[PDB]
Structures are given as C-alpha cells and as structure tokens.
Amino acid sequence: AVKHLIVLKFKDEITEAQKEEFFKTFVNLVNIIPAMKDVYWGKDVTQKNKEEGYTHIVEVTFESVETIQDYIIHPAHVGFGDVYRSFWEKLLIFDYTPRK
Amino acid sequence: AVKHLIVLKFKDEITEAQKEEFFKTFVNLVNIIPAMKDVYWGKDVTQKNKEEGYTHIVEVTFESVETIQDYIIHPAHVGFGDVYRSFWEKLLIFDYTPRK
C-alpha cells in the first residue's frame, strides 16, 4: 500500500473549530472517493521544530501510486481544495510505499 | 497510539547502499528498545516540495506519548545518532495521535 502524507500549517486567522471541521470533512471524503482507502490526522504535540511552523499531519492510504492521481482530480477532492484552500499557510506532501 | 514521524533529507555524498543499511539498522532498534512497537520507512516518489528537499519518511509507533521519552534517551537511540548523524542534512520531527 502507498501512503500520501500531508504536513501542514494553518493560517493564523483559522480557529480551532474551523480546523476540526476541515479535518472532519477531509476524513469523510473516504466514503465518496474510491481511490481513498483510509485517512488519519493529528496535531503535533512536541514542537521540536517550531521555526518551520508545521503543526498538523494527515495520512491517506492508497492501493498504488497510480490511484493517487484518481484522487487528485476526483471532483470531491477538487471541491475540498476549492472550499478550504484559504485555510492553509503551507504544506509538504510525500507519497511513498511503507517498508521495513 | 502515538506516531513519531521523522522527515529526512540525506547529504549528497551518502550512497544508496548506506541509506538502505541506515534504515535496516533503524528498523532493528525495535528489537532492543522496548518502547518502539512498530517501524516503517519510505522514500517519497513525487518530489512536489520544491524548496525543502526532504526525501524520506520514518514512522515509529508508541503505546503512549510518555513512552516516547523511553526511546529518546535510550542508549541504543543515542548510539544510532552517534553512528549515523553525518548521514542526514536535516530532519523534521513530529509526534501525534492518529485520529478521525
């Protein structure tokens, strides 16, 4: 399985309630985008690199690297971006196959 | 469960074989550090983050936020840093509880 990892910082003006609604909406995308198999998110608790400012993590599970693209251009994902684009200040994205 | 996420970039002179052995050794820490419950790593394939350059992800599972400290100061973890810190150029650390 492939992981789509999002590391993000919200803009200062976004409230806690707004962040909660943002993540709730994103988690619920799993039901309507076939390529999305699972979602978890969380807030960093350690603040080891404050200077970089990232605060939140989202992890999305996919069957393959190829199905990530199905998710990217799915109208529900495009709609999510259209609605919440103003919420985030910056993000890092990674796509990888977990191994050990 | 709490996840301990390491986001890394290697120095340019580090070989592919060195990277593989680095992760093999890191994964094997589970056997000698009780607090480590699981580990996976992976290499980003998308390279969508222009200015930051991080290439690899390590995720370690812990039973609680408290047991992360048992890993942090464990001599096997300190030793890993002493042997391999010259391998990485920079790293970001995050600790979070995955949720819906």
Swiss-Prot record, chains A, B:
Which positions in this protein are listed as binding Mg(2+)?
A: 30, 33, 36
Q: InterPro entries under this entry?
A: Dabb, Dimeric_a/b-barrel, HS1/DABB1-like
Q: Which residues bind 3,5,7-trioxododecanoyl-CoA?
A: 4, 71
What are the catalytic residues? 71, 74
The answer on whether this UniProt entry bears the keyword rRNA-binding reads no
Question: To which pathway does this protein belong?
Answer: Secondary metabolite biosynthesis; terpenoid biosynthesis
Q: Which GO terms describe its molecular function?
A: cyclase activity; lyase activity; metal ion binding
E.C. designation(s): 4.4.1.26
**Keyword Disulfide bond applies:** no
**Which reaction does this enzyme catalyse, per its entry?**
3,5,7-trioxododecanoyl-CoA = olivetolate + CoA + H(+)
What GO biological process, any one, is recorded here?
A: olivetolic acid biosynthetic process
Under PROSITE patterns, the record lists: S_R_A_B_BARREL (PS51502)
Report domain Stress-response A/B barrel positions.
2-96
Q: What does this protein do?
A: Involved in the biosynthesis of cannabinoids-related terpenophenolic natural products, which have pharmacological activity. Polyketide cyclase which functions in concert with OLS/TKS to form olivetolic acid. Has no intrinsic polyketide synthase activity and requires the presence of OLS to produce olivetolic acid.
Q: How does it assemble?
A: Homodimer.
This protein is called: Olivetolic acid cyclase
Source organism per UniProt: Cannabis sativa
